[model samples]
Target chain A: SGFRKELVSRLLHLHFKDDKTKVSGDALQLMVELLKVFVVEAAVRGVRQAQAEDALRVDVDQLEKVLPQLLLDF
Target chain B: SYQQRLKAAVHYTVGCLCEEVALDKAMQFSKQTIAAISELTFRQCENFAKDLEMFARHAKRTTINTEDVKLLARRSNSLLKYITDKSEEIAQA
Candidate 1:
């Protein structure tokens, strides 16, 4: 019902091999939570950036301003 | 970059979360910002992916489980607690 787990699992598999690399079910769920957090936090940062600039909506201008710091925080 | 489906989900989630926090009227996102957001997540994912692999490898185990995840968050105080609390909720369910 949330973020897709299998795809991220596949992503990790792409880095390593499935023959040796594996992620437990709940562990994968936690990873998905982190991913969701990133989405929400980035959106919040964008919104904050727009609010600061008194913009009606968040544009790439605001997002680009926040990305450097956002990427650092995550 | 993140997967296409993941990118779509990220965009949808941004819309969903932004609407809740918008000050007044309608707060929206430009398409450019949404794609940029996905890119941000992709790089973020890169770190966690590498950590998980290393965490599993260090244990001489092939699988990454909750303990490994715990170690990943051990560097942060509230973050680790928050995740562990959520983990308990997951188990308590």
Candidate 2:
């Protein structure tokens, strides 16, 4: 359960616009792996927040409130 | 352009970390680590900026303000402190 390869490729292209400049393939793969983890973690946190609030479904409001807490750090 | 910015941001962040730890030599970060950091920073910052823009729109303002940033920073204690410090510095000016 990870990001689609096409989406990852698209993101890579967005970051590295020059098609000629070679990027490390291993680095791109690792980035995809970390992105999977980050998404899972954020979803889990959002679910928990929604649960605590007795909401039946996770919505954008909960996500907006929870994401900053999950992402930012010291 | 994005690639260059990403690389520069990663380099600066690694340099800061090395300085914080007082490493004897230049600390070389793994390609994977650098890539992960770059991607995460880009993704998160984009989302955050969008949210801040919405907040400004809700307030019927065209420009985002410190209050909006501070609200976002409330999620993390350290971030809040950093924003508070910066705001105080701005006030002093």
Candidate 3:
């Protein structure tokens, strides 16, 4: 719900332009839902990892460390 | 004793999840992988508990509060949101 529709539309267009595929409303909505889940799960795992390491903050480096495990489970 | 306890806990958790046939039947996990995961999980828990204890000590309190855990979880924005949502859901129930 917090995702930008125009951004999603542009991304879909960019990826599908070569195939001349039309992105349906449902497809776009599903993509947004999937993206939200992915982002939230990644952030949560990254934060847990940073905390475990006693890091002052969760930055790109911390997220990078956690991403592989998250991706494996996903 | 701690090692045995950890192994039992890990086995129990895995068994409980595996009891859910609809999902468990879809995939299988190797014993070696499960053992490795259990060790990792124990280490992570140990680290988190140590940090939380330190936070409590810094606050001059004997107990760790929900706030301490929340503060720890806030390292990532999405994690904070996810926890907040869960807290609200529990409150509603």
TM-score, chain B only, every model? Answer: 0.71, 0.68, 0.70
> In order, what lDDT does every prediction score?
0.72, 0.49, 0.47
TM-score of every candidate = 0.79, 0.45, 0.47
Poorly placed runs, candidate 3 (over 4 Å) = A1-74, B18-25, B89-93
- lDDT (10s digit) by residue, model 3, range B1-93: 645754465444433432232132333333443344444443444444455456656777655444544554556666556655654454465
Model 2 pairs in collision: none
How does model 1 fare in lDDT? Answer: 0.72
TM-score of 3: 0.47
Using DockQ, rank the candidates from best to worst.
Answer: 1, 2, 3
Error of 3 at B88 (Å): 3.8
- Writing each residue's lDDT as its tens digit, candidate 1 over B55-76 gives 8889888889887777766765
Interface alpha-carbon RMSD, every candidate = 2.8, 15.7, 21.5
For residues A1-74, write the lDDT of model 2, one tens digit per residue.
44443444444455332344222343334334434444444545555666677775555565566766666541
Model 2 regions lying over 4 Å from their true place:
A1-74, B1-29
Q: Model 2 Cα displacement at A74 (Å)?
A: 9.9
Candidate achieving higher DockQ, 1 or 3: 1
CAPRI-style docking class of model 1 based on DockQ: medium
- As a whole number from 0 to 100, the lDDT of residue A35 in candidate 2 is 44
